[PDB]
Amino acid sequence: HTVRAAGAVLWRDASTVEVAVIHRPRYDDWSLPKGKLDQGETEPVAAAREIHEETGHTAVLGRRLGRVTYPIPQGTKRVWYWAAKSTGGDFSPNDEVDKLVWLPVDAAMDQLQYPDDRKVLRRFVKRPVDTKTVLVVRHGTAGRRSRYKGDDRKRPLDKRGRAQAEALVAQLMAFGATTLYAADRVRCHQTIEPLAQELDQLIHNEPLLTEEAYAADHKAARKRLLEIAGRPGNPVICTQGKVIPGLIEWWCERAKVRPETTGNRKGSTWVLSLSDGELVGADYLSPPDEK
Ligand SMILES: Nc1nc2c([nH]c(=O)n2[C@H]2C[C@H](O)[C@@H](COP(=O)(O)OP(=O)(O)O)O2)c(=O)[nH]1
Ligand SMILES: [Mg+2]
């Protein structure tokens, strides 16, 4: 059996980057915060939970730092790691962690004993970490254009898609979503309506980011993407299957960013990490009810 886990390089602004290293009595080891996925939990949601459970900090996830695989007695441990900025809380000793230290990255590398954690910290230092995040979401499942009676623009999410929309709230809050944009289609708006309620935030309607608009004027949609991305906060943009591959691929080619994963599924999220207006990460997340 392979055990699926997620964790983070939790860091704070000391005033100046310091990274958290945790000590576990059981092993007498120093490592990065991580833990197993609960039933129905996505990797990002688990990473955020495990930060809170092991360090007592609240954090916002940024750039994905790849995956590690190592043997355990039970078989194989597989862990996805995120950069995560502390936004609050404080260390409290718990059932697994008795000590936490905050170190500059060079001192943290020496403190970490496992090769796979040092691999992860090397990925963390290679690019900026004080990032802002654009979250590009394909709308949830919404049935078939082929069977819909009515204006197709009005076609609503189906039951599965409404569940994806509810499950995206925890997914997008883990990345500190703060502002909301949707293509001018009901199924796009309904996908981030639950997040809108959680944030008490209005969704801005985007006629330039529909399939029809994108197909006829790609350049207007690319400019509007960069305009949204330039605004303060972490925007969510919910759009359609025939828009997202083109925008992501165009931005990754121009920035020379290589996505480690890829897909275009209904309910999927691209996590675009920006530092000083430059793309530094493009992280594909499966739909919350897939994997
Ligand atoms: N945390 C961690 N443990 C590692 C790594 N490499 C390695 O060999 N180990 C060892 C530490 C242990 O010997 C073993 C399992 O530790 P864990 O995955 O933390 O699982 P548990 O929380 O106990 O369920 O792998 C590594 O990169 N990180
Ligand atoms: Mg753990």
Swiss-Prot record:
Result of knocking out the encoding gene: 12-fold spontaneous mutation frequency increase by rifampicin resistance screening.
Enzyme Commission identifier(s): 3.6.1.69, 3.6.1.58, 3.6.1.61
Record key words, sorted: DNA damage, DNA repair, DNA replication, Hydrolase, Magnesium, Metal-binding
InterPro entries tied to this protein: His_Pase_superF_clade-1, His_PPase_superfam, Nudix_hydrolase, NUDIX_hydrolase-like_dom_sf, NUDIX_hydrolase_CS, NUDIX_hydrolase_dom
Catalytic activity as recorded in UniProt: 8-oxo-dGTP + H2O = 8-oxo-dGDP + phosphate + H(+); 8-oxo-GTP + H2O = 8-oxo-GDP + phosphate + H(+); 8-oxo-dGDP + H2O = 8-oxo-dGMP + phosphate + H(+); 8-oxo-GDP + H2O = 8-oxo-GMP + phosphate + H(+)
SUPFAM superfamilies: Nudix (SSF55811), Phosphoglycerate mutase-like (SSF53254)
Entry GO MF terms: 8-oxo-7,8-dihydroguanosine triphosphate pyrophosphatase activity; 8-oxo-dGDP phosphatase activity; 8-oxo-GDP phosphatase activity; metal ion binding
Binding site for substrate: 24-27, 29, 34-36, 70, 77, 96, 114
Residues noted as binding Mg(2+) 1 in the record, renumbered to the chain: 34, 54, 96
Cofactor(s) needed for function: Mg(2+)
Nudix hydrolase domain boundaries: 1-125
Keyword Hydrolase attached: yes
Gene3D superfamilies registered for this protein in UniProt: Nucleoside Triphosphate Pyrophosphohydrolase (3.90.79.10), Phosphoglycerate mutase-like (3.40.50.1240)
Binding residues for Mg(2+) 2: 50, 54, 96
GO biological process, alphabetically ordered: DNA repair; DNA replication
Co-factor binding comment: Can also use Mn(2+), with lower efficiency.
Coiled-coil regions listed in the entry: none
Residue span of motif Nudix box: 35-56
Regulation of protein activity: Ap4A hydrolysis is inhibited by fluoride ions.
Domain remark in the UniProt entry: Contains an N-terminal Nudix hydrolase domain, followed by a linker region and a C-terminal histidine phosphatase domain. The C-terminal domain is necessary for efficient catalysis by the Nudix hydrolase domain.
Function as written in the Swiss-Prot or TrEMBL entry: Catalyzes the conversion of 8-oxo-dGTP to 8-oxo-dGDP, and 8-oxo-GTP to 8-oxo-GDP. At high enzyme concentrations, can also catalyze the conversion of 8-oxo-dGDP to 8-oxo-dGMP, and 8-oxo-GDP to 8-oxo-GMP. In addition, catalyzes the hydrolysis of the diadenosine polyphosphates diadenosine hexaphosphate (Ap6A), diadenosine pentaphosphate (Ap5A) and diadenosine tetraphosphate (Ap4A).
UniProt family annotation: Belongs to the Nudix hydrolase family.
Record-linked PANTHER family: 8-OXO-(D)GTP PHOSPHATASE, NUDIX HYDROLASE 23
Subunit field text: Forms head-to-tail homodimers.
Stated name of the protein: 8-oxo-(d)GTP phosphatase
Name of the encoding gene: mutT1
